[PDB]
Amino acid sequence: NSALDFLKHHLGAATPENPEIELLRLELAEMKEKYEAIVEENKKLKAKLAQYE
Amino acid sequence: PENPEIELLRLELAEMKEKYEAIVEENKKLKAKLAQYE
Known part of the structure; x- marks a missing residue:
């Protein structure tokens, strides 16, 4: 069941905020x-070259 | 860190x-080819 599936993924131990991941995402x-x-x-x-050639 | 998610991010x-x-x-x-006309 798609309804139950979604529920099963959005419930439980959330992901702890990893500082390395936040950095990389910002990079x-x-x-x-x-x-x-x-x-x-x-x-x-490229627009300029179009003038020539 | 040998974390798949972290390594994936480094790959991107x-x-x-x-x-x-x-x-x-x-x-x-x-720029270099442009100054061959300009």
């Missing part, structure tokens, strides 16, 4: 921020 | 970083 978010910025720049450089 | 962090070093490298070529 991931941070790295993704930087990546998306450069994707913007990368798209601008 | 490493991938995102690899995807990021590729555009950084990708633009290197662009």
